[PDB]
Amino acid sequence: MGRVRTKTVKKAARVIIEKYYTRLGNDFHTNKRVCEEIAIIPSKKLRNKIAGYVTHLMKRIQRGPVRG
Amino acid sequence: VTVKDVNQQEFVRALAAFLKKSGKLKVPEWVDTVKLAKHKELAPYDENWFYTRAASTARHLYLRGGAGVGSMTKIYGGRQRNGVMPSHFSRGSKSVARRVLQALEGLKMVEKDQDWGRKLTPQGQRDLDRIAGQVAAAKKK
Amino acid sequence: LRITTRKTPCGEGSKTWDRFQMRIHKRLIDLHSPSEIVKQITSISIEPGVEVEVTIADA
Amino acid sequence: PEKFQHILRVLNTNIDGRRKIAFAITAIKGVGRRYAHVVLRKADIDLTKRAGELTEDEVERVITIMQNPRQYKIPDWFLNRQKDVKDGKYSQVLANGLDNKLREDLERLKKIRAHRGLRHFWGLRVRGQHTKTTGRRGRTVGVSK
Amino acid sequence: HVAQIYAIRQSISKALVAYYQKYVDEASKKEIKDILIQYDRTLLVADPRRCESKKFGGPGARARYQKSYR
Amino acid sequence: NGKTFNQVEIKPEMIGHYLGEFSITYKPVKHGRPGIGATHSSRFIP
Amino acid sequence: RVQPIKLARVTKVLGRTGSQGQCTQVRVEFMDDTSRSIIRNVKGPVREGDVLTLLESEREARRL
Amino acid sequence: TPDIKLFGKWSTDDVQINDISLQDYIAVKEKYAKYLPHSAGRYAAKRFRKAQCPIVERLTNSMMMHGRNNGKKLMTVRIVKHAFEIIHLLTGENPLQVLVNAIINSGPREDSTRIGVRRQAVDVSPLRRVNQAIWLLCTGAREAAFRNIKTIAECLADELINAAKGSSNSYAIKKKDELERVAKSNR
Amino acid sequence: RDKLNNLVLFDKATYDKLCKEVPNYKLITPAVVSERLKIRGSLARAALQELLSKGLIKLVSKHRAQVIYTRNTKG
RNA sequence: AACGAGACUCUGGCAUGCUAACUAGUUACGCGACCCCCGAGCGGUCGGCGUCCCCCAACUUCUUAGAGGGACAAGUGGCGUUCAGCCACCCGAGAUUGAGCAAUAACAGGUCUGUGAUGCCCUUAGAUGUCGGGGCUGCACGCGCGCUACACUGACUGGCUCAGCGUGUGCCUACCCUACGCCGGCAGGCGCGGGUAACCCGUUGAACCCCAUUCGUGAUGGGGAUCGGGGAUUGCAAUUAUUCCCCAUGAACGAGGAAUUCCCAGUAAGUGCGGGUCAUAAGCUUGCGUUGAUUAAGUCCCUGCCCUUUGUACACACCGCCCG
């Protein structure tokens, strides 16, 4: 199966959130474009994975705060 | 009716009788001692095979112009069983296909094409359409 | 173009192979113009190892 | 229909009238399928009959066409002994002349002691096949003393 | 001879469903779309199965030649 | 034949054969006794 | 030695038993009084909800 | 009928699966009624996708076996076709009910596993009951018409008939009875 | 193998029995008629085509690999 | 913190959205023409068939190939220390295509017969550096990879109707792919053209499969070994038959002992087609399509692999060591 993200994806998503916290929402097709415009991801698959982990983190930051 | 609107296996059967009902379409002399292709083992069962193959060649020329001997011999080519070794594809017999096309020209049914090859005449399209209509009206298709 | 060779000299080992291949791309352009202007425009800005062939009558 | 005598004794060989003619006369040597079909077509007799349905005025015609083929327009490229090595004839050798011709050909070869005769004498393979791993008629050899 | 029967049978359905959605009403096409897609898919949606490539060391994509110790 | 000029007296029966078809290039073999590698039943030495 | 047949419905899949992992432990009720339950070893591809037929229902499965 | 496909001729309503276990694993009627036992059929994709397959296409698939029959399915549809007509003549009952009864009469419900010649008895899942029934019914027709003058279509109908009319004269019912006897010994 | 000595053509006894079986058989195929009598099986085809011509049996299916008849579409 | 995994590259699946095409097409009618009434009708007008001919017609659906798009466990329900994640489902072209590349450390693995890579030793004019002839193919026997079969879910004879990946005129080196006419039963021959190729062979009329005949459980019309006689082609030369064609002869074999190999979906198996070697030539291998199942969704029993704890008289490492 898989679907376990790698440290290169998780660290990128954590930095993207920790800097542009107020531009990111709850839908995936907008976070994709935001991360596309604020960073430089040298692939499209990596862009989708980073933007998909950003959404899963945002859905949690609306609850109690995460520890990273 | 058109030729494409009727079952072709009955069309060939009717056209074979049409051809072997006139007395024309002079057959070769070696009709009883010929194997019909390299990849065969016996002579054709049907004694009057030349009229069936003439009808088949004519209905094939109705469907594609400019056919010529080198394609009739590909249209009748099949599989050859090389005894103990694997099988392969094989051509028909140039002599048979050439004599069939020459015997059809002897009926004003076909003519040599403008580009090299053979083609139906206007008089041949009519003879095929009449037999198509006859077959269609017979079986009430 | 494809060439599939054995990977080893000498014929020993597991029987692996290598698959090399070259790819040739081709395009054509058609113009209706005097030949002088054609030689004017076709002989400028040819950077890579692309071919450029000019034929005087094809239509 | 017409349970009449079926077992035929054609020249030096037994035919069973229980089979179709084109496959019954192949029981004779020198007569295969491709030959028998032509011999039956030239003789104008039917081809859906069992071999017992032939009265004594058909079998005779069939065999006299089977033995003198070039008379009845059977071609040359179709006969089993062409340009006969010692007489220049064209013929189908049929029933017992077949074994005699074969033995005469083997003896001719062995006489001048050509190579084919020497392979026929030693009971080996006459064409160019490998004999290291095929044929294999004898018994197993023991390696432990 | 058999991959073309399915092509024809899918194409004429894909045609009648497209003609009903451009020159007729919308419900008049979504009725026949459901009538077709309930009895059987592959009447409107093609299937992506394709042949797989042969690899060296076997007569096909997955089979291997016979191993032989001793 | 590769080492030796074996002699032949030409007879009117050999007309149209090859002269090479009358002196063989090898000895017709008579077998010995099978040696150490001849079967899987045989391997061992000290 | 004389017992009728008993149909039993599967309500839980426990695990794969046997040397090759070739059969499955399954808990069943008895189609007549749901207050009964036993554990059996089934040979085929059993889902949850299927109905098994028992030629001998007074037995119970230990393992293997 | 304009909305009810039969088989061309064989109506698929009024056919009763008289088992409570084997239904939901025999797809005869009311949603799996189709004109021919031939679909694209990506049924070997997930675990239980196989039970949704029509039963006549589960027999057509299994009948083409032993080497020089693989992929020859248009030859294996005409076999089932010619056999259903033979069945309708010899008996008179709807040929699908004979097939259902034959599938029921020939799937074993007890069987035995080699364990630790030690065997231990176990009970058969319904899907495996259907699979074993189909395999046994096809092997009987295969072995019956291997060197006979009878055809593969006469012997398939013979098998189906002797199985639906439980008689022990069919290969499938002899085999079922052996597996259940051998399993009863190892109980 | 075995020895199946079938008859290549009929005799009068078998020939009358072949017409006295017509109302009896629900399924008629060449193989069944081969197994009932001792018939060469390629004679059974001709016998059934002859019986069909005389309206004595009814054709329910004909195919290259199979032919099926039944008794007069009755019972 | 670094390498390997992953990311990455090629490939298969989707776009009626973009870009744009007589070396690709569609539709339209300009058409024109053939043919049949097959329909109303008359046969005409309307239609029906066309790889029959045209368009400086309109377009890109099918073909081509570029740019972008699109899938992320994103949505919903369960299970999760509510974390990492797992199962199911809606929507969808798709919710798990297939390959390429690949680490530290090592093996007395293979290659001196790929090399104008190479150390040392040997030979060097009676040569271990060139022409003619023979061998590498010889046959009591043991073994490995494979081809064809053991027939009726078949063989034979006719009829019908569908592909994809490729290659194609050679410099030294002299040979390429073929259309179409004629001649010959056949292999093959003669004569005239096209193609350095989306242009010609070619709309690649492939085989299995499909539809009808004959056979009838008999080593039979299953099988095609072995052998006789004749005819062609390549080549400087065919005998120890190079390859091909024709008539004839018609062996074992009726599903295979103990053992043992490969395989999860467009996959196994059946089936044919190209490339490689190739003056001549595939039962080999390397790719391509075509028909298309049964069985699994597991386990550690057998054979092995990875990580932890433990024991050791081993370290040439259990194929070890070692006692009388």
Ligand SMILES: [Mg+2]
């Ligand atoms: Mg394959």
Ligand SMILES: [Mg+2]
């Ligand atoms: Mg660290």
Ligand SMILES: [Mg+2]
């Ligand atoms: Mg969730």
Ligand SMILES: [Mg+2]
């Ligand atoms: Mg859906």
Ligand SMILES: [Mg+2]
């Ligand atoms: Mg992958």
Ligand SMILES: [Mg+2]
């Ligand atoms: Mg490595």
Ligand SMILES: [Mg+2]
């Ligand atoms: Mg080296």
Ligand SMILES: [Mg+2]
């Ligand atoms: Mg050296």
Ligand SMILES: [Mg+2]
């Ligand atoms: Mg070498």
Ligand SMILES: [Mg+2]
């Ligand atoms: Mg030299």
Ligand SMILES: [Mg+2]
């Ligand atoms: Mg030399």
Ligand SMILES: [Mg+2]
């Ligand atoms: Mg060698």
Ligand SMILES: [Mg+2]
């Ligand atoms: Mg090998």
Ligand SMILES: [Mg+2]
């Ligand atoms: Mg055929």
Ligand SMILES: [Mg+2]
């Ligand atoms: Mg085969």
Ligand SMILES: [Mg+2]
């Ligand atoms: Mg090949």
